[PDB]
Coordinates of C-alpha atoms and ligand atoms in Angstrom, one line a residue:
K1 CA 0.1 0.0 0.1
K2 CA 2.5 2.7 1.2
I3 CA 4.1 3.6 -2.2
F4 CA 7.4 5.9 -1.7
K5 CA 7.6 8.2 -4.5
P6 CA 11.1 8.3 -5.7
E7 CA 11.3 12.0 -4.9
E8 CA 10.1 11.3 -1.4
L9 CA 13.0 8.8 -1.1
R10 CA 15.5 11.1 -2.9
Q11 CA 14.5 14.1 -0.5
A12 CA 14.6 12.0 2.6
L13 CA 17.9 10.0 2.0
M14 CA 20.1 12.1 0.0
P15 CA 21.0 14.0 3.0
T16 CA 22.3 10.9 4.6
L17 CA 24.5 10.2 1.6
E18 CA 25.8 13.8 1.5
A19 CA 26.6 13.2 5.2
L20 CA 29.1 10.5 4.1
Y21 CA 30.5 12.5 0.9
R22 CA 31.4 15.5 3.3
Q23 CA 33.9 13.4 5.0
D24 CA 37.3 14.1 3.9
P25 CA 39.5 12.1 3.3
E26 CA 37.5 9.2 4.5
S27 CA 35.0 9.3 1.8
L28 CA 37.5 9.5 -1.0
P29 CA 38.1 5.8 -1.3
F30 CA 34.5 5.2 -1.6
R31 CA 33.4 8.0 -4.1
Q32 CA 33.9 6.0 -7.3
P33 CA 33.7 2.3 -8.5
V34 CA 36.8 0.4 -7.5
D35 CA 39.2 0.1 -10.4
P36 CA 41.2 -3.0 -9.5
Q37 CA 43.9 -2.5 -11.9
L38 CA 44.4 1.1 -11.8
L39 CA 44.3 0.7 -8.0
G40 CA 47.0 -1.8 -8.2
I41 CA 44.9 -4.5 -6.8
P42 CA 44.0 -7.6 -9.1
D43 CA 42.5 -10.0 -6.7
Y44 CA 39.8 -7.5 -5.7
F45 CA 37.1 -9.4 -7.6
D46 CA 38.1 -12.6 -6.3
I47 CA 37.0 -11.4 -3.0
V48 CA 34.4 -8.8 -3.6
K49 CA 31.6 -10.3 -5.9
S50 CA 29.0 -7.5 -5.5
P51 CA 31.1 -4.0 -5.8
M52 CA 29.3 -1.0 -4.5
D53 CA 30.1 2.6 -4.0
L54 CA 28.8 6.2 -3.3
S55 CA 28.5 7.2 -7.0
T56 CA 26.5 4.0 -7.9
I57 CA 24.2 4.7 -4.9
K58 CA 23.8 8.4 -5.8
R59 CA 22.9 7.4 -9.2
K60 CA 20.3 4.6 -8.1
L61 CA 18.8 7.5 -5.8
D62 CA 18.6 10.1 -8.3
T63 CA 17.1 7.9 -11.1
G64 CA 14.4 6.2 -8.6
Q65 CA 15.7 2.7 -8.7
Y66 CA 14.9 2.1 -5.1
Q67 CA 11.3 1.1 -4.3
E68 CA 11.8 1.3 -0.4
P69 CA 14.5 2.7 1.9
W70 CA 15.9 -0.5 3.2
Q71 CA 17.4 -1.0 -0.3
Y72 CA 19.3 2.0 0.1
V73 CA 20.5 1.0 3.5
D74 CA 21.5 -2.4 2.2
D75 CA 23.6 -1.0 -0.6
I76 CA 25.2 1.4 2.0
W77 CA 26.1 -1.7 4.1
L78 CA 27.2 -3.7 1.1
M79 CA 29.9 -0.8 0.3
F80 CA 30.9 -0.8 3.9
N81 CA 31.4 -4.8 4.4
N82 CA 33.0 -4.9 1.0
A83 CA 35.7 -2.6 2.3
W84 CA 36.0 -4.3 5.6
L85 CA 36.2 -7.6 3.7
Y86 CA 38.9 -6.8 1.5
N87 CA 41.0 -4.5 3.6
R88 CA 43.1 -5.5 6.7
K89 CA 41.8 -4.3 10.2
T90 CA 44.8 -2.3 10.5
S91 CA 44.7 -0.6 7.1
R92 CA 43.8 2.9 6.0
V93 CA 40.6 2.2 4.1
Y94 CA 39.3 -0.1 6.9
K95 CA 39.4 2.6 9.5
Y96 CA 38.1 5.1 7.0
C97 CA 35.1 2.8 6.3
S98 CA 34.5 2.4 9.9
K99 CA 34.3 6.4 10.2
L100 CA 31.7 6.5 7.4
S101 CA 29.5 3.7 9.1
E102 CA 29.5 5.7 12.5
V103 CA 28.2 8.8 10.5
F104 CA 25.9 6.7 8.7
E105 CA 24.4 5.1 11.6
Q106 CA 23.7 8.3 13.5
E107 CA 22.3 9.9 10.3
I108 CA 20.1 7.1 9.0
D109 CA 18.2 6.1 12.1
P110 CA 16.1 9.4 12.6
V111 CA 15.2 9.5 8.7
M112 CA 14.1 6.0 8.8
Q113 CA 11.8 6.8 11.7
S114 CA 10.5 9.9 9.9
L115 CA 9.5 7.5 7.1
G116 CA 7.3 5.4 9.4
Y117 CA 9.9 2.8 10.4
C118 CA 10.9 1.3 13.8
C119 CA 14.2 2.5 13.2
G120 CA 17.0 2.5 10.7
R121 CA 19.6 0.3 12.4
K122 CA 21.4 -2.6 10.8
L123 CA 21.0 -5.3 13.5
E124 CA 22.7 -8.6 13.5
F125 CA 22.8 -11.2 16.4
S126 CA 26.0 -11.9 18.7
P127 CA 28.2 -14.5 17.5
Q128 CA 28.3 -17.9 19.0
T129 CA 31.2 -19.0 20.9
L130 CA 33.0 -22.0 19.1
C131 CA 34.2 -24.8 21.5
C132 CA 37.2 -27.3 20.4
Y133 CA 36.7 -31.0 20.3
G134 CA 40.6 -31.1 20.7
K135 CA 40.5 -30.2 24.7
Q136 CA 38.1 -29.8 27.6
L137 CA 37.3 -26.1 27.6
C138 CA 39.5 -24.7 24.6
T139 CA 37.5 -22.1 22.7
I140 CA 37.8 -20.2 19.3
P141 CA 38.0 -16.5 19.0
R142 CA 36.0 -14.0 17.0
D143 CA 37.5 -13.3 13.7
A144 CA 40.5 -15.8 14.1
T145 CA 41.1 -18.6 11.7
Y146 CA 39.7 -22.0 12.6
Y147 CA 39.2 -25.6 11.1
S148 CA 35.9 -27.3 10.9
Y149 CA 34.1 -30.4 9.6
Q150 CA 30.4 -31.1 8.9
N151 CA 29.7 -27.7 10.7
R152 CA 30.2 -30.0 13.8
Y153 CA 33.9 -30.6 14.5
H154 CA 35.9 -27.4 14.9
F155 CA 39.4 -26.9 16.0
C156 CA 41.4 -23.7 16.7
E157 CA 44.4 -23.1 14.5
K158 CA 47.0 -24.2 17.2
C159 CA 45.3 -27.4 18.7
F160 CA 44.8 -28.3 15.0
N161 CA 48.5 -28.2 14.0
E162 CA 49.4 -29.8 17.4
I163 CA 48.1 -33.4 16.2
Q164 CA 51.3 -35.2 14.5
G165 CA 50.4 -36.2 11.0
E166 CA 47.5 -35.6 8.6
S167 CA 44.7 -37.5 10.4
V168 CA 42.2 -36.4 12.9
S169 CA 40.0 -38.6 15.0
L170 CA 36.2 -37.8 15.8
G171 CA 33.9 -39.6 18.3
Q172 CA 35.8 -43.4 16.4
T173 CA 36.5 -42.6 12.6
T174 CA 39.5 -40.8 10.9
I175 CA 39.4 -37.7 8.7
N176 CA 42.3 -36.2 6.7
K177 CA 43.0 -32.6 7.5
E178 CA 42.3 -31.9 3.8
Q179 CA 38.7 -32.6 4.5
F180 CA 38.3 -29.7 7.1
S181 CA 37.2 -26.3 6.0
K182 CA 39.7 -23.4 6.9
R183 CA 37.5 -20.3 8.0
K184 CA 37.3 -17.2 10.2
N185 CA 34.7 -17.0 13.0
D186 CA 33.2 -13.8 11.6
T187 CA 29.7 -14.8 10.8
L188 CA 26.9 -12.6 11.9
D189 CA 23.2 -13.5 11.3
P190 CA 21.0 -10.4 10.6
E191 CA 17.8 -9.8 12.7
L192 CA 14.7 -10.4 10.8
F193 CA 11.9 -8.4 9.5
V194 CA 8.3 -8.7 9.6
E195 CA 5.9 -6.7 6.9
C196 CA 3.0 -4.5 7.9
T197 CA 0.1 -6.3 6.2
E198 CA -1.7 -2.7 5.6
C199 CA 1.2 -0.1 4.6
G200 CA 3.7 -2.8 3.6
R201 CA 6.6 -1.4 5.7
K202 CA 9.3 -3.8 6.7
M203 CA 10.1 -3.5 10.6
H204 CA 12.4 -5.5 12.6
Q205 CA 10.5 -8.2 14.2
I206 CA 12.3 -7.6 17.6
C207 CA 11.5 -3.9 17.7
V208 CA 7.7 -4.3 17.1
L209 CA 7.6 -7.6 19.2
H210 CA 5.4 -9.4 16.6
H211 CA 4.8 -13.0 17.4
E212 CA 2.9 -15.3 15.0
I213 CA 1.2 -17.3 17.6
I214 CA 0.0 -14.5 19.8
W215 CA -1.4 -12.5 16.6
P216 CA -2.1 -15.0 14.0
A217 CA -4.0 -12.5 12.0
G218 CA -0.6 -10.9 11.0
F219 CA 1.5 -7.8 11.7
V220 CA -0.1 -4.3 11.7
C221 CA 2.4 -1.5 12.7
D222 CA 1.3 1.1 15.4
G223 CA 1.2 3.9 12.7
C224 CA -1.4 1.9 10.7
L225 CA -3.3 1.1 14.1
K226 CA -3.5 4.6 15.3
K227 CA -4.9 6.1 12.0
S228 CA -8.0 3.9 12.6
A229 CA -7.9 4.2 16.4
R230 CA -7.2 0.4 16.7
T231 CA -5.0 -1.4 19.2
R232 CA -3.5 -4.8 19.3
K233 CA -5.5 -7.7 20.6
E234 CA -4.4 -8.6 24.1
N235 CA -1.4 -10.9 24.5
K236 CA -2.8 -13.9 26.6
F237 CA 0.7 -15.6 26.7
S238 CA 1.8 -13.4 29.6
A239 CA 3.7 -14.3 32.7
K240 CA 0.7 -13.4 35.0
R241 CA -1.4 -16.1 33.3
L242 CA 1.0 -18.9 33.8
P243 CA -0.5 -21.3 36.6
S244 CA 0.1 -19.9 40.2
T245 CA 1.6 -22.2 43.0
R246 CA 1.9 -21.8 46.6
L247 CA 5.5 -21.2 46.5
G248 CA 5.3 -18.6 43.5
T249 CA 2.5 -16.8 45.2
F250 CA 4.5 -16.8 48.5
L251 CA 7.6 -15.2 46.7
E252 CA 5.7 -12.6 44.7
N253 CA 3.8 -11.5 47.7
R254 CA 6.8 -11.1 49.6
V255 CA 8.5 -9.0 46.7
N256 CA 5.7 -6.8 45.9
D257 CA 4.8 -6.1 49.9
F258 CA 8.6 -4.9 49.9
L259 CA 8.3 -2.7 46.9
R260 CA 5.0 -1.2 48.4
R261 CA 6.9 -0.3 51.6
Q262 CA 9.7 1.4 49.6
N263 CA 7.1 3.4 47.7
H264 CA 10.0 4.2 45.2
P265 CA 8.7 6.2 42.0
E266 CA 8.1 4.4 39.0
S267 CA 7.9 0.7 40.7
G268 CA 6.5 -2.1 38.7
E269 CA 4.6 -5.1 40.1
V270 CA 6.7 -8.4 40.2
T271 CA 5.3 -11.7 39.0
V272 CA 7.0 -14.9 40.3
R273 CA 6.2 -18.3 38.7
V274 CA 7.4 -21.9 39.3
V275 CA 7.7 -23.4 35.8
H276 CA 9.0 -26.9 36.7
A277 CA 8.8 -29.4 39.2
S278 CA 9.9 -33.0 39.0
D279 CA 11.4 -35.8 40.9
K280 CA 15.0 -37.0 40.3
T281 CA 17.9 -38.7 41.8
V282 CA 21.5 -37.9 42.2
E283 CA 23.9 -41.1 41.9
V284 CA 27.0 -41.3 44.0
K285 CA 29.8 -41.3 41.3
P286 CA 32.4 -44.2 41.0
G287 CA 35.0 -43.3 43.2
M288 CA 32.9 -42.6 46.3
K289 CA 30.6 -45.4 45.4
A290 CA 33.6 -48.0 45.6
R291 CA 34.6 -46.4 48.8
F292 CA 31.3 -46.4 50.8
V293 CA 28.3 -47.6 48.8
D294 CA 29.7 -51.1 48.1
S295 CA 30.4 -51.7 51.8
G296 CA 26.9 -50.2 52.7
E297 CA 28.0 -47.2 54.5
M298 CA 26.2 -44.7 52.2
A299 CA 23.3 -44.9 49.9
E300 CA 23.9 -45.4 46.2
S301 CA 21.8 -42.4 45.3
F302 CA 19.6 -39.6 46.8
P303 CA 16.1 -38.6 45.7
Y304 CA 15.3 -34.9 45.4
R305 CA 12.8 -32.6 43.8
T306 CA 14.1 -30.1 41.4
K307 CA 12.1 -26.8 40.8
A308 CA 12.6 -23.9 38.4
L309 CA 11.2 -20.5 39.0
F310 CA 11.4 -17.2 37.3
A311 CA 10.4 -13.4 38.3
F312 CA 9.1 -11.0 35.6
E313 CA 8.4 -7.3 35.6
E314 CA 6.4 -5.2 33.2
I315 CA 8.9 -2.7 31.4
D316 CA 7.3 -0.3 28.7
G317 CA 3.9 -2.2 28.7
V318 CA 5.8 -5.7 28.0
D319 CA 6.8 -8.6 30.0
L320 CA 10.6 -8.8 31.0
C321 CA 12.1 -12.0 32.8
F322 CA 14.9 -10.9 34.9
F323 CA 15.6 -13.5 37.4
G324 CA 15.7 -17.3 37.2
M325 CA 16.8 -19.9 39.7
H326 CA 16.8 -23.8 40.0
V327 CA 16.8 -25.7 43.2
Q328 CA 17.2 -29.1 44.7
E329 CA 15.1 -30.3 47.5
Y330 CA 15.8 -33.4 49.4
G331 CA 12.8 -34.5 51.5
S332 CA 12.2 -36.1 54.8
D333 CA 12.1 -39.7 53.1
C334 CA 15.6 -39.2 51.7
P335 CA 18.6 -41.1 53.3
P336 CA 21.3 -39.2 55.3
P337 CA 23.3 -37.1 54.9
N338 CA 20.9 -35.4 52.4
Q339 CA 17.7 -35.5 54.6
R340 CA 15.7 -32.3 54.7
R341 CA 18.3 -30.2 52.9
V342 CA 17.9 -27.7 50.0
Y343 CA 20.6 -26.8 47.6
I344 CA 20.5 -23.8 45.0
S345 CA 21.5 -25.3 41.8
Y346 CA 22.1 -22.1 39.9
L347 CA 20.5 -18.6 39.7
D348 CA 20.8 -15.8 37.2
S349 CA 19.8 -12.6 36.3
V350 CA 19.3 -9.9 33.7
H351 CA 19.9 -6.5 34.9
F352 CA 17.0 -4.5 33.5
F353 CA 14.8 -4.3 36.7
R354 CA 13.3 -0.9 37.6
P355 CA 13.9 0.8 39.7
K356 CA 17.7 0.1 39.5
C357 CA 18.3 1.0 43.2
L358 CA 16.0 -1.8 44.4
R359 CA 17.2 -4.6 42.0
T360 CA 19.6 -6.3 44.6
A361 CA 17.1 -5.8 47.4
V362 CA 14.7 -7.6 45.2
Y363 CA 16.8 -10.5 44.6
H364 CA 17.5 -10.8 48.3
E365 CA 13.7 -10.8 49.0
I366 CA 13.3 -13.7 46.5
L367 CA 16.0 -15.8 48.3
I368 CA 15.1 -14.8 51.8
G369 CA 11.3 -16.0 51.0
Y370 CA 12.5 -19.1 49.5
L371 CA 14.4 -20.0 52.6
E372 CA 11.4 -19.1 54.7
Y373 CA 9.1 -21.1 52.6
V374 CA 11.2 -24.3 52.8
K375 CA 11.7 -24.0 56.4
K376 CA 7.9 -23.6 57.0
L377 CA 7.7 -27.0 55.2
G378 CA 10.4 -28.6 57.6
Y379 CA 13.6 -28.4 55.6
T380 CA 16.5 -27.9 58.1
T381 CA 19.2 -26.6 56.1
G382 CA 20.1 -24.6 53.1
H383 CA 23.3 -25.0 51.2
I384 CA 24.9 -22.5 48.6
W385 CA 27.9 -22.8 46.6
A386 CA 28.9 -19.2 45.8
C387 CA 30.5 -19.8 42.2
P388 CA 30.4 -17.1 39.6
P389 CA 29.9 -18.3 35.8
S390 CA 33.1 -19.1 34.1
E391 CA 34.0 -16.5 31.5
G392 CA 31.4 -15.7 28.9
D393 CA 29.2 -18.5 30.0
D394 CA 25.7 -18.2 31.3
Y395 CA 23.9 -20.2 33.9
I396 CA 20.2 -19.8 32.7
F397 CA 19.9 -16.7 30.3
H398 CA 21.7 -17.0 27.0
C399 CA 23.8 -13.8 26.0
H400 CA 23.8 -11.3 28.8
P401 CA 24.2 -7.5 28.1
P402 CA 27.9 -6.8 27.5
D403 CA 27.7 -4.1 30.2
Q404 CA 26.3 -6.2 32.8
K405 CA 29.3 -7.0 34.9
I406 CA 29.8 -10.6 36.4
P407 CA 30.9 -10.5 40.2
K408 CA 34.2 -12.3 41.2
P409 CA 33.9 -14.7 44.1
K410 CA 34.6 -12.2 47.0
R411 CA 32.0 -9.8 45.7
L412 CA 29.5 -12.7 45.1
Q413 CA 30.2 -14.1 48.7
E414 CA 29.6 -10.7 50.4
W415 CA 26.4 -10.7 48.4
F416 CA 25.2 -13.9 49.9
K417 CA 26.4 -12.9 53.3
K418 CA 24.2 -9.5 53.1
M419 CA 21.3 -11.5 52.1
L420 CA 21.7 -13.9 54.9
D421 CA 22.3 -11.3 57.5
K422 CA 19.0 -9.9 56.6
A423 CA 17.5 -13.4 56.8
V424 CA 19.1 -13.7 60.2
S425 CA 17.7 -10.3 61.4
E426 CA 14.3 -11.4 60.2
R427 CA 14.5 -14.6 62.4
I428 CA 14.1 -16.8 59.2
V429 CA 17.8 -18.0 59.2
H430 CA 18.9 -19.3 62.7
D431 CA 22.6 -18.8 61.8
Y432 CA 25.0 -19.9 59.0
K433 CA 28.7 -21.0 58.7
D434 CA 31.1 -21.8 56.0
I435 CA 31.5 -25.4 55.4
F436 CA 34.8 -25.9 57.4
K437 CA 33.3 -24.5 60.7
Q438 CA 30.1 -26.3 60.1
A439 CA 31.9 -29.7 59.7
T440 CA 34.0 -28.8 62.9
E441 CA 30.7 -28.1 64.8
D442 CA 29.0 -31.2 63.5
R443 CA 32.1 -33.2 64.5
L444 CA 32.3 -34.5 61.1
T445 CA 34.9 -37.4 60.6
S446 CA 34.1 -38.8 57.1
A447 CA 33.4 -37.6 53.6
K448 CA 30.5 -40.1 53.6
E449 CA 28.7 -37.6 56.1
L450 CA 29.0 -34.6 53.6
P451 CA 25.7 -33.8 51.7
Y452 CA 25.9 -34.9 48.3
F453 CA 24.3 -32.5 45.6
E454 CA 23.9 -33.2 41.8
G455 CA 26.4 -30.9 40.2
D456 CA 28.1 -29.7 43.2
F457 CA 31.7 -29.1 43.9
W458 CA 32.2 -31.7 46.8
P459 CA 31.0 -34.8 44.7
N460 CA 33.9 -34.0 42.1
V461 CA 36.6 -33.0 44.5
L462 CA 36.0 -36.2 46.6
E463 CA 36.6 -38.3 43.2
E464 CA 39.8 -36.5 42.8
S465 CA 41.0 -37.0 46.5
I466 CA 40.2 -40.7 46.5
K467 CA 42.1 -41.2 43.2
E468 CA 45.2 -38.8 44.3
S469 CA 45.5 -40.6 47.7
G470 CA 45.1 -43.9 46.3
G471 CA 42.0 -44.9 48.3
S472 CA 41.3 -42.4 51.1
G473 CA 38.0 -40.5 51.0
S474 CA 38.7 -38.4 54.2
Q475 CA 42.5 -37.8 54.8
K476 CA 42.8 -34.2 53.6
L477 CA 39.0 -33.3 54.1
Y478 CA 39.4 -30.7 56.6
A479 CA 42.3 -29.1 54.7
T480 CA 40.2 -29.1 51.5
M481 CA 37.3 -27.6 53.3
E482 CA 39.4 -24.8 54.9
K483 CA 41.1 -24.0 51.8
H484 CA 37.7 -23.4 50.0
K485 CA 35.6 -22.4 52.8
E486 CA 34.6 -18.7 51.8
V487 CA 32.7 -20.2 48.9
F488 CA 30.3 -22.7 50.7
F489 CA 27.7 -21.6 52.8
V490 CA 25.7 -23.9 55.3
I491 CA 22.4 -22.1 56.5
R492 CA 20.6 -23.5 59.4
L493 CA 17.0 -22.9 59.2
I494 CA 15.8 -25.3 62.0
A495 CA 18.3 -25.6 64.9
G496 CA 18.9 -28.1 67.6
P497 CA 16.5 -30.4 69.1
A498 CA 13.5 -29.3 67.0
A499 CA 15.3 -30.6 63.9
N500 CA 15.2 -34.1 65.3
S501 CA 11.5 -34.5 65.8
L502 CA 9.8 -33.1 62.9
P503 CA 6.8 -34.3 61.0
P504 CA 7.0 -35.5 57.2
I505 CA 7.7 -32.9 54.7
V506 CA 4.6 -32.6 52.6
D507 CA 4.8 -30.2 49.6
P508 CA 1.3 -28.8 48.8
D509 CA 2.3 -27.9 45.4
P510 CA 1.7 -30.6 42.6
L511 CA 4.5 -31.7 40.2
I512 CA 4.8 -29.6 37.1
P513 CA 6.1 -31.3 34.0
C514 CA 8.1 -28.9 31.7
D515 CA 11.0 -30.6 29.9
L516 CA 12.2 -27.2 28.8
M517 CA 13.0 -26.1 32.4
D518 CA 14.3 -29.5 33.8
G519 CA 17.7 -28.0 34.7
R520 CA 19.6 -25.2 32.9
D521 CA 20.5 -26.9 29.8
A522 CA 17.3 -27.1 27.6
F523 CA 16.4 -23.3 27.9
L524 CA 19.9 -22.4 27.0
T525 CA 19.8 -24.7 24.0
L526 CA 16.5 -23.3 22.8
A527 CA 17.7 -19.8 23.2
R528 CA 20.9 -20.5 21.2
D529 CA 18.9 -22.3 18.5
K530 CA 16.4 -19.5 18.1
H531 CA 18.5 -16.4 18.7
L532 CA 16.9 -15.6 22.0
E533 CA 19.4 -13.3 23.7
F534 CA 19.0 -11.3 26.7
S535 CA 21.7 -8.7 25.8
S536 CA 19.7 -5.7 25.4
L537 CA 16.2 -4.5 26.8
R538 CA 14.6 -5.1 23.4
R539 CA 16.0 -8.4 22.8
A540 CA 15.3 -9.7 26.3
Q541 CA 11.7 -8.2 25.8
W542 CA 11.4 -10.5 22.6
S543 CA 13.2 -13.5 24.3
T544 CA 10.7 -13.3 27.3
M545 CA 7.9 -13.0 24.8
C546 CA 9.1 -16.3 23.2
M547 CA 9.9 -18.0 26.2
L548 CA 6.2 -17.4 27.5
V549 CA 4.8 -18.8 24.4
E550 CA 6.9 -21.8 24.8
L551 CA 5.9 -22.3 28.5
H552 CA 2.2 -21.8 27.7
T553 CA 2.1 -23.9 24.6
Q554 CA 4.2 -27.0 25.6
Ligands
1VU601 C1 26.1 -22.5 41.9 C2 26.0 -21.1 41.4 C3 25.2 -20.0 42.1 O1 24.0 -20.3 42.7 S1 26.0 -18.7 42.8 C4 26.4 -17.7 41.1 C5 25.1 -16.9 41.1 N1 25.0 -16.4 39.7 C6 25.7 -15.6 39.0 O2 26.8 -15.2 39.4 C7 25.3 -15.4 37.7 C8 25.8 -13.9 37.3 N2 25.2 -12.9 38.2 C9 24.0 -12.3 38.4 O3 23.1 -12.4 37.9 C10 24.1 -11.2 39.4 O4 25.5 -10.8 39.7 C11 23.4 -11.6 40.8 C12 24.3 -12.8 41.4 C13 22.0 -12.0 40.6 C14 23.3 -10.4 41.7 O5 23.3 -9.2 41.0 P1 23.3 -7.7 41.7 O6 22.5 -7.8 42.9 O7 23.1 -6.7 40.7 O8 24.9 -7.6 42.5 P2 26.2 -7.4 41.5 O9 27.2 -7.5 42.4 O10 26.0 -8.3 40.2 O11 26.2 -5.8 41.0 C15 25.9 -4.8 42.0 C16 27.1 -3.8 41.6 O12 28.4 -4.4 41.7 C17 29.1 -4.2 40.3 N3 29.8 -5.3 39.9 C18 29.3 -6.3 39.6 N4 30.6 -7.1 39.3 C19 31.5 -6.4 39.3 C20 32.9 -6.4 38.9 N5 33.3 -7.6 38.5 N6 33.7 -5.4 39.1 C21 33.2 -4.3 39.4 N7 32.0 -4.1 39.6 C22 31.1 -5.1 39.7 C23 27.9 -3.9 39.3 O13 28.2 -3.3 38.1 C24 27.0 -3.1 40.2 O14 27.1 -1.6 40.2 P3 25.8 -0.8 40.5 O15 25.1 -1.3 41.8 O16 25.0 -0.8 39.4 O17 26.6 0.5 40.7
ZN602 ZN1 14.0 -1.5 14.0
ZN603 ZN1 41.9 -25.8 20.8
ZN604 ZN1 1.7 -0.1 8.6
ZN605 ZN1 16.0 5.1 43.3

C-alpha cells in the first residue's frame, strides 16, 4: 500500500548520503567504483563479488531505482562490508570505512523513523562461542582462523596443527586434515523483518515484538493502528497467566509487599512463577561408590525434587524476565546425609529491573522468601555454593548484556552474606557458617557425612581426592574444606532439638512437567537455536515473549 514516490525517497535519504560525501579524506576511497588494476589490486574481484560505491548509490537514488528505503540501506552496508572484507583491520581504508559507518548510523536512524519505520539500524545477532573437540574447554576467538568438519567438529588453529600427522579422529573414525574447512569465525546473522500487512513497511520483528502465535491474523504496525484508532489484541501468553503455585505466590507477595513499603517512584509489580517441578535422583559417582556404597556405608543415590522459578516485571508495557533460579530439595524420606536439605543449583539475572536502586534488594527478597518457605515445610538446612559463571558462560539466560558485570568470588560471597544477614535479622535463618566451621561443629569425621548434591563441587573433588590418595576419602578433607571455605555456605533454618522430631515434609504444590525447564541446559539450547538473547532490553523483551509462548504451549 504505502508507495514511496522516488522524490520522497531522494529528498529523505540524500542528506544521509551527502553526510558521507562530506567526510574528507575518509569518503574519497568510496566515491567511485573500485578500478582493481588502476588501484594496483588484481584479486579484488576474487574477494568482492558485489561491488558498490557512493556514486552508484547516488545514481540509483537520483534515477528512482529504490522502491523502499531499506534497499538504500542495504547498498550502503554492502559498500561498507566490501571494504571491511577486502582490507586489513589495520589498514587505511578499513578505518575510513568504520568512520563513514558511524556517521551513517547516526544519520540514518532518525530519517528511517520519519518514514514510518521502527528504526534505521543495521542489526545482527551476537556471534556464538565455538568450542574445540581437541581439549576440554578450549575455545575459538571471534574473527580468528579455525578448522571445521560438517559444521560439527571445529579446531583452533593452534590445537589443530598440534596433532602429529595428517589425520584427525572424531567420536571413532579418521578424517584427513584436507577434509576440514579453513574459515574465520566472523559470521553474524541479521535480525529478521516482518512486513506490515496494511502499509507494507518492513520492520524489525524484535522492534515491534510481533509473534505469529500471539497475533495469528498478522502484523499491523502502530502507525496503521493509530490511523484507525485500533489497538493490538491482548497478549494472553503473559507471565501473569502462567499457573500459580503456593511457592510462586508466596515469593511474589513478599516482593511486592517490599516494593510497596519502599514506595519508590516508577515501581512495577513483580510476578513470580514456578515453571518446573519434578522428582529426580543424584547417583554417587564411581570413586565414592567404590569407597562407601559397596560396603553399605552410604546410599547409592539420593532422591530430590528439582524446581525452576522465574521473576518477571512489566517494562514499557511488556513482560521482562529478569531473574531465574533452580533448586534441589531433599525431603524427609531421603537417606542421610541429604535428609531435609535444600541446595541452590544455579541462579541468574538480567539487569533491567526497575528501579535500579532496588534490584539487589529484590533478588535478596526472593532468596530470603525461598529460605523462609522451605523452612516452613520442615527443611532444616540450606546450601549455597558461591560460584560465578566461567568467562562468557551463562547459567540460565543466554547472552547477557555486555555491560552487565559479572561478580568475582569475593563480591558474590559478600552478596550472599548480606542476604543471609537480613534473613538472620528477620529470624528466618537461625545462623550460617562456612563448610569448614560447620563440619567442625558437626564433629564430622568422614566424607560420607557430607551432603551430596547433583552438580556440586564436593562430589567432584571427592572423586579426585580418593584417586590422588590411592584410596582415602577423608585424609585431607578438613584441609580441603578450610582451603575453599569462603565459597560454601551452610544455612541453618531449623536448629537443635527441634530438627530431630519433625513431622514428614509434605509439599502442597503439585508436580509440574516442563522438559524445557528440567535443569538449565534445555532453555539455554532453545535460546541459542532461536537467537533468543538477553543482551539488550529489546532482545530480552523478545526473548521473554518467546519463552512465555513456549511455556504456555508446551
Ligand atoms: C552455583 C552458582 C550459584 O548459585 S552462585 C552464582 C550466582 N549467579 C551468578 O553469578 C550469575 C551472574 N550474576 C548475576 O546474575 C548477578 O550478579 C546476581 C548474582 C544475581 C546479583 O546481581 P546484583 O544484585 O546486581 O549484584 P552485582 O554484584 O552483580 O552488582 C552490583 C554492583 O556491583 C558491580 N559489579 C558487579 N560485578 C563487578 C565487577 N566484576 N567489578 C566491578 N563492579 C562489579 C555492578 O556493576 C553493580 O554496580 P551498581 O550497583 O550498578 O553500581
Ligand atoms: Zn527497527
Ligand atoms: Zn583448541
Ligand atoms: Zn503499517
Ligand atoms: Zn531510586
